[PDB]
Amino acid sequence: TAIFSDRYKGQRVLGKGSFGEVILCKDKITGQECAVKVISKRQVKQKTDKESLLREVQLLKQLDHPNIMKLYEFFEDKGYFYLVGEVYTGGELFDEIISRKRFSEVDAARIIRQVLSGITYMHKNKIVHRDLKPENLLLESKSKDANIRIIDFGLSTHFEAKKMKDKIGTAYYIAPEVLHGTYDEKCDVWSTGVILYILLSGCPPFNGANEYDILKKVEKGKYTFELPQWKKVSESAKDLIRKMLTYVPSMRISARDALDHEWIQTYPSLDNAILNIRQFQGTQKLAQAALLYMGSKLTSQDETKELTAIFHKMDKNGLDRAELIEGYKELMLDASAVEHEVDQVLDEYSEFVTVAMDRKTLLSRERLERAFRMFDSDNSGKISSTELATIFGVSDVDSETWKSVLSEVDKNNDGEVDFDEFQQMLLKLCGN
Numbered sequence: 001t002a003i004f005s006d007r008y009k010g011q012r013v014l015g016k017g018s019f020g021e022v023i024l025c026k027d028k029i030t031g032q033e034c035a036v037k038v039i040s041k042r043q044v045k046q047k048t049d050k051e052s053l054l055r056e057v058q059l060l061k062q063l064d065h066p067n068i069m070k071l072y073e074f075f076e077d078k079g080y081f082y083l084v085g086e087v088y089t090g091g092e093l094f095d096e097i098i099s100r101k102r103f104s105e106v107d108a109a110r111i112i113r114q115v116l117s118g119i120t121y122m123h124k125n126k127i128v129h130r131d132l133k134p135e136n137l138l139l140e141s142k143s144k145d146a147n148i149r150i151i152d153f154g155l156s157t158h159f160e161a162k163k164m165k166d167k168i169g170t171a172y173y174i175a176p177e178v179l180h181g182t183y184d185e186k187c188d189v190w191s192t193g194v195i196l197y198i199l200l201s202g203c204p205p206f207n208g209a210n211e212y213d214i215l216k217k218v219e220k221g222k223y224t225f226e227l228p229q230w231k232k233v234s235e236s237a238k239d240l241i242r243k244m245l246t247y248v249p250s251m252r253i254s255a256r257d258a259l260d261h262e263w264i265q266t267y268p269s270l271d272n273a274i275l276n277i278r279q280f281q282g283t284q285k286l287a288q289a290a291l292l293y294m295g296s297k298l299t300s301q302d303e304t305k306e307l308t309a310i311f312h313k314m315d316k317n318g319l320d321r322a323e324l325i326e327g328y329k330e331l332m333l334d335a336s337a338v339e340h341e342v343d344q345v346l347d348e349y350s351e352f353v354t355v356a357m358d359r360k361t362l363l364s365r366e367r368l369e370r371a372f373r374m375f376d377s378d379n380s381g382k383i384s385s386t387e388l389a390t391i392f393g394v395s396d397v398d399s400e401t402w403k404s405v406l407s408e409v410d411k412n413n414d415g416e417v418d419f420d421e422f423q424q425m426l427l428k429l430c431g432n
């Protein structure tokens with residue numbers, strides 16, 4: 001009965017989440033700001049019936065913990081679900097850590113105590129996450145020492161996630177038992193052990209050249225503390241990771257027993273871990289940016305041709321401000337974006353579409369350039385072919401496919417690419 005549009009108005013895109021986009025919205029009466037995840041029913045399949053979802057959402061709205069995201073409302077119309085919740089402006093935990101000069105075992109324990117606090121509370125209320133990862137750890141405020149909020153706790157039991165643009169950075173943290181189908185709340189302890197391992201080394205315990213190679217390592221479940229970074233880390237931290245990364249879930253420690261472990265109650269600097277976590281986060285974010293870029297090029301290519309056909313059928317006189325605005329509503333807030341587009345583009349409908357979308361292409365190029373620049377930590381202007389293999393590995397582009405495309409852009413490259421070349425390689429990888 002309740003309609004979303006009759007209560008909230010969109011302000012700006014906050015980013016992307018799992019199962020849909022996150023928009024910053026404002027209540028039309030009280031002005032309260034909210035983060036709204038919009039889930040398209042055509043793009044996302046329901047694991048359970050509509051009765052099971054309403055009951056889990058009802059329970060989730062009544063739960064309250066300082067380390068769990070607050071869900072306020074839930075709406076559904078013919079083609080979408082709207083999860084309305086609280087706004088957390090501090091960003092993702094790992095983005096805060098890469099900006100820090102120093103990071104110690106006390107900072108890591110403080111983080112993991114919060115993550116385990118949220119989990120324990122949620123396990124007492126029989127909610128499992130399943131997809132606990134760094135992206136689902138948002139900081140309440142801009143500051144470094146701020147409260148961590150776990151996002152999407154309980155969504156996975158009712159929504160199915162395949163697209164490589166999504167699914168990037170998920171294989172590192174997934175519990176082996178989730179892969180074979182029989183899992184319970186202990187899967188969330190495994191994921192926290194993986195995150196804890198990365199916080200104290202900067203490297204995942206189960207790693208590989210591509211998604212499937214990572215999953216092979218996870219499934220075998222063997223890892224080591226046999227890297228130079230672990231020498232400067234205490235045996236009590238190694239003992240907790242061992243208990244949390246125990247293969248058989250019945251033998252694995254509970255989230256509650258992890259809070260009461262010697263390490264969390266008891267707790268220098270881990271410099272090599274910050275350098276590795278910078279590189280890990282840089283690689284993750286560039287691969288993501290590369291996939292978003294290729295996605296935006298096909299979306300714009302589709303939208304330009306679909307909008308041209310609509311504006312051509314609208315053209316009776318062999319152009320018109322009211323007609324140009326009318327065309328945008330046919331392919332679908334949309335009128336206000338058109339009013340801002342027509343005023344800026346002007347400052348022929350064929351010349352309009354090119355400028356209106358070349359503005360959108362420049363915006364798409366600059367987001368990719370930011371992630372390239374941030375990945376290029378030594379400011380060389382280039383990334384090696386080895387760095388490309390890692391990048392194209394995490395974005396699941398086949399080795400022979402990107403190496404072929406590279407020789408087509410520049411035949412006399414010496415195992416390095418500049419930004420323009422990288423951009424040119426991605427355009428060729430999406431039929432452009």
Ligand SMILES: Nc1nc(-c2cccc(Cl)c2)c(-c2ccc3ncccc3n2)s1
Nearest residue numbers: 014017018022035036037083085087088
């Ligand atoms: N995976 C993600 N899902 C959400 C989300 C949003 C609303 C409802 C629900 Cl159930 C989940 C995210 C979120 C939450 C707050 C945020 N606040 C400021 C910036 C980005 C934010 N993103 S990330």
